[PDB]
Amino acid sequence: QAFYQVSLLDHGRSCDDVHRSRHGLSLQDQMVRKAIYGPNVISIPVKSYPQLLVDEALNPYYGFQAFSIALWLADHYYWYALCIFLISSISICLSLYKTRKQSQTLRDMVKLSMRVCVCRPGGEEEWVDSSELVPGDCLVLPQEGGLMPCDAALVAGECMVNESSLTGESIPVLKTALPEGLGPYCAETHRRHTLFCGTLILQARAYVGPHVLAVVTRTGFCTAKGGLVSSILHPRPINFKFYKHSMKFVAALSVLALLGTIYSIFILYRNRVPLNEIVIRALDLVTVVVPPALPAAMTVCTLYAQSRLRRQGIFCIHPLRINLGGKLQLVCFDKTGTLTEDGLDVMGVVPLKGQAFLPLVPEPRRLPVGPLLRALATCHALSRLQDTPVGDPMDLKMVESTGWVLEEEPGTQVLAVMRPPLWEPPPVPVSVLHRFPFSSALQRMSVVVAWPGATQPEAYVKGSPELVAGLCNPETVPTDFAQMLQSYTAAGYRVVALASKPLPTVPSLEAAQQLTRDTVEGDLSLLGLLVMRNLLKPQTTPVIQALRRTRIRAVMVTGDNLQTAVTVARGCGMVAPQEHLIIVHATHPERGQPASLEFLPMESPSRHLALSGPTFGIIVKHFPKLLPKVLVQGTVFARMAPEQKTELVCELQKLQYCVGMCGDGANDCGALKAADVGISLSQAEASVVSPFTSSMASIECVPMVIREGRCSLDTSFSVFKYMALYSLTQFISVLILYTINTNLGDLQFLAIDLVITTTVAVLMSRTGPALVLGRVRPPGALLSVPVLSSLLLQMVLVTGVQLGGYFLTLAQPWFVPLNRTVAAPDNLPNYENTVVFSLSSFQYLILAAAVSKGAPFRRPLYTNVPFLVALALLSSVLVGLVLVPGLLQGPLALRNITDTGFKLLLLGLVTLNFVGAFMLESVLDQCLPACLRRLRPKRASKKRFKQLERELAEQPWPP
Ligand SMILES: Nc1ncnc2c1ncn2[C@@H]1O[C@H](COP(=O)(O)OP(=O)(O)O)[C@@H](O)[C@H]1O
Ligand SMILES: *[C@@H]1O[C@H](CO)[C@@H](O)[C@H](O)[C@H]1NC(C)=O
Ligand code: ALF
Ligand SMILES: [Mg+2]
Numbered sequence: 001q002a003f004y005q006v007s008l009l010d011h012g013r014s015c016d017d018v019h020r021s022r023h024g025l026s027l028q029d030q031m032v033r034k035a036i037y038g039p040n041v042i043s044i045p046v047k048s049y050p051q052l053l054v055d056e057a058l059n060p061y062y063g064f065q066a067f068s069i070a071l072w073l074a075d076h077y078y079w080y081a082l083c084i085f086l087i088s089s090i091s092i093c094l095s096l097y098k099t100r101k102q103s104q105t106l107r108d109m110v111k112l113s114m115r116v117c118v119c120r121p122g123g124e125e126e127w128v129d130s131s132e133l134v135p136g137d138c139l140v141l142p143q144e145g146g147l148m149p150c151d152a153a154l155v156a157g158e159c160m161v162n163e164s165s166l167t168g169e170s171i172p173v174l175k176t177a178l179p180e181g182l183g184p185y186c187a188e189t190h191r192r193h194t195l196f197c198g199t200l201i202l203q204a205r206a207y208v209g210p211h212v213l214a215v216v217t218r219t220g221f222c223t224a225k226g227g228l229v230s231s232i233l234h235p236r237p238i239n240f241k242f243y244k245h246s247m248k249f250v251a252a253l254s255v256l257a258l259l260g261t262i263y264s265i266f267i268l269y270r271n272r273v274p275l276n277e278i279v280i281r282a283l284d285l286v287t288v289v290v291p292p293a294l295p296a297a298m299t300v301c302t303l304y305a306q307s308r309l310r311r312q313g314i315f316c317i318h319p320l321r322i323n324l325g326g327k328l329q330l331v332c333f334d335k336t337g338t339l340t341e342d343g344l345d346v347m348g349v350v351p352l353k354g355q356a357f358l359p360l361v362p363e364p365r366r367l368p369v370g371p372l373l374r375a376l377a378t379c380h381a382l383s384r385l386q387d388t389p390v391g392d393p394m395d396l397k398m399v400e401s402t403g404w405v406l407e408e409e410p411g412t413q414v415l416a417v418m419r420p421p422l423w424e425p426p427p428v429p430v431s432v433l434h435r436f437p438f439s440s441a442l443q444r445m446s447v448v449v450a451w452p453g454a455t456q457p458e459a460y461v462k463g464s465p466e467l468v469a470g471l472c473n474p475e476t477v478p479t480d481f482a483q484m485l486q487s488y489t490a491a492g493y494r495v496v497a498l499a500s501k502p503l504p505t506v507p508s509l510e511a512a513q514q515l516t517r518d519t520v521e522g523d524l525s526l527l528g529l530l531v532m533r534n535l536l537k538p539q540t541t542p543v544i545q546a547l548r549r550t551r552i553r554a555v556m557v558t559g560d561n562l563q564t565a566v567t568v569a570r571g572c573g574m575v576a577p578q579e580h581l582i583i584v585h586a587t588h589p590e591r592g593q594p595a596s597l598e599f600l601p602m603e604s605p606s607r608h609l610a611l612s613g614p615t616f617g618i619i620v621k622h623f624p625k626l627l628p629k630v631l632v633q634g635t636v637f638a639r640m641a642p643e644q645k646t647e648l649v650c651e652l653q654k655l656q657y658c659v660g661m662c663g664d665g666a667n668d669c670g671a672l673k674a675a676d677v678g679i680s681l682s683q684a685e686a687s688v689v690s691p692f693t694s695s696m697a698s699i700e701c702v703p704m705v706i707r708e709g710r711c712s713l714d715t716s717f718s719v720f721k722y723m724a725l726y727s728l729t730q731f732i733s734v735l736i737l738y739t740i741n742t743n744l745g746d747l748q749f750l751a752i753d754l755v756i757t758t759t760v761a762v763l764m765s766r767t768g769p770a771l772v773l774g775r776v777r778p779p780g781a782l783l784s785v786p787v788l789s790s791l792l793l794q795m796v797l798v799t800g801v802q803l804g805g806y807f808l809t810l811a812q813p814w815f816v817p818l819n820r821t822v823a824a825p826d827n828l829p830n831y832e833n834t835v836v837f838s839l840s841s842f843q844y845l846i847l848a849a850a851v852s853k854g855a856p857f858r859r860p861l862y863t864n865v866p867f868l869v870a871l872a873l874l875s876s877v878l879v880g881l882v883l884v885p886g887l888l889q890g891p892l893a894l895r896n897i898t899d900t901g902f903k904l905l906l907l908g909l910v911t912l913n914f915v916g917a918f919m920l921e922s923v924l925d926q927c928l929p930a931c932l933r934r935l936r937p938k939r940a941s942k943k944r945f946k947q948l949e950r951e952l953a954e955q956p957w958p959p
Helices: 015-021 028-037 050-056 060-075 078-110 225-232 243-271 275-289 294-312 321-326 335-339 371-378 393-402 465-471 481-491 540-549 562-572 613-622 627-631 642-654 666-674 701-739 747-766 785-811 831-852 866-883 886-892 900-935 944-954
Strands: 116-120 123-129 138-140 144-148 152-156 158-163 169-175 199-205 213-216 330-333 345-351 383-385 388-390 415-419 430-436 444-450 458-463 495-502 525-533 553-557 581-587 596-602 608-611
Touching (some): 050 078, 078 747, 330 335, 335 562, 371 495, 388 393, 465 495, 481 525, 540 553, 562 581, 562 608, 627 944, 701 747, 701 785
Antiparallel strands (some): 158 169, 383 388, 458 495, 581 596
């Protein structure tokens, strides 16, 4: 009767229900469920070519150009129509290629199919089906190096999986068996028992089970790998798109087009040409005003920039966003693997005798056998790859520091057995009973471990110092724990605290392993603090100094302790030594206490604010009026959960800041997607994780993403402004002829539009970006006073030389007057056509050189090379033709002029116009300040960030 969403069908499923779904029906249920859900295939439509063309041809311009071709054919200027078709043909081919390439990349990612082993309710079938996989299907996963087709909760056993594409996470991720329960929660809601579509399985092992077996949850390409590709198809728009502002500027040109048309009507009525004939002249005037090569030129800008970035390594999707790059005002960054260096030496461990802390051991090897050694060795979730161990750089560096070595493949629920170094001045090899994974939000990991001693099993928890110390029973927790940790965090050593609890369970029993994560991480005794050292990436310190110099503010958003983040921030130059940092702190509103905000300064040898994640939580919920003041003044947001990073992005965006994100981790995945320009620095090739994936592991990417964006925005504005200048230059030329004896050209028009303008337009879009990122932001409105001024003033100079030419031509003593008695197509030679075309031809080229204006955002024009050769070549051909048309006289329909003097006068006028155009654009750059000061002495931006800044300047936060 009424359709129900697949999510709505399977939203309330119990923990038990996922186990109920396991060993699902072989065929009848499969078929009906598969029919209801639909086939498990990516929904990218496949088009041979002509299938695309019909859809592609529906664009409104294409209709107008088709009408124009017919109109020009009716006028019998076949040649101009021959060009007008050909330029549209180039436009459609390039648009087709652009569209085809954009789909092809996405389609190539999702073009994967492989034979799958599927479990029957009383069966275990092998390689039976893949694309037809049942929505609730249970399958046995491959042993090693196996891509997972569907998002499936793991019912039994443990899996090691590479999720690099899905989460931006290169490091191997542990997967564990789901626990059946009366409560219903989704596998995604667990966010760990689920195995995600399109993720490689490094290894798969069942300690107790015969093999690893998983039950499919959300599937059919509409979730995970496809859910994100599906996002890339029909993508989210950008608000207040600059094309609207250009469309307003087109209306200013529309007034000129109407004014021209009425001028023509009066001239034609005065001329007394047939009314039927005058309509064709009016129609030609309107069609000429439309530029044929603009629609192609807009595509070629983007395609060249994608080309420029692909070579730099910054692999891009949604190429429209490259311009958005140009406008970004703040760039958010992450601490570890981006601002700092991935991989960290263990700078020893600190042990505690009783309540008191003992002095730090430089090398973890030289320590007594007991809890801390075992915890340091066993806490990690490292697995053994072919002749090697694979894990998180921190956990890997820790175990190598201990000197204990992981045992290989060769009880029941016993895994990752840890072999001792077997050097003595007890070896007691130790085996893990239960593994708990590490979640960024959760901020800790835990293990249950047993030994041949066969005592009560001991649970070891390695986590963030504050949370672990808080979780520990306050018996062992030292009085000065905070102050002692403050030494290590202030130094800039990433610190993880280890806590041990003796657990009263039966050792080496599978059943005994089953336990509540909270119950294992409940009552705890603080054991020691690890002192990991992460060092700043060499290039980070430079890029941040440039981004601060441009006045694009850099905010730091991190899950690590506030003092370490402050040390990294003070190091990079987020906060310079001259600048002052305030630590906003908040007390929770609860019992008899209301919410309290306390601001305490920090002093080290622009009023920068550093806020812990929890303080920001209280500020957003219980101080909404203050949030604008802190988010426009906050530089080092720290101890932030993955969800909190998205909130900073969203609140900074609602304040009208254009955000950017350059994180390299699973924690940032949310923030990267939400942010305007999102960059994932550790990924290889194109990925769905971020809009602007990089393959360089540095912040050196971020300047390049801005620098190219500003170039693309200036190229878009230059190509638009040159296309307007050409059309008005054509309008003036065709009109000067329309008044004067009702004449035009055919082969001449093909030559100008097809060779002079289309070649220059495509070739002017490959100049490339400026060397250094600049203070001045690229101009963002096409309908601006400088742009409008520049175009209008230049067209006056175009007309001046053009009219001057005609006056000089008529004034020439040898000059023979025209006919003004026969139709424009019939009068194949006209003495005026020769002069007007010959003067105008060169000026069409000159406009591009003046328009280029390559300095703040783009490199000098000469550096282009293919443009510069074409400009010179076409100029040389035109110089050659104007001096001696020879053979080309006949095709050009040129009236041969023997006199050298008038040709030199004509060359002089073009040179004068050229000098004029260059002088006018240089004058325009110099004149802007005087104009701006007089037009507006002072102004206030509607955007909230610029006002809140100005308010804070007038009255600061309480000092
Ligand atoms: N493998 C781990 N097991 C337990 N705790 C960890 C582990 N790695 C990091 N931590 C701690 O938990 C915090 C949360 O990490 P995360 O949010 O991913 O940020 P980051 O890794 O940048 O510090 C870390 O800052 C650190 O204190
Ligand atoms: C110009 O063209 C006309 C055709 O109308 C023809 O008589 C002769 O070639 C020239 N003379 C005049 C009448 O303008
Ligand atoms: F490594 Al982070 F936020 F600093 F993920
Ligand atoms: Mg990270």
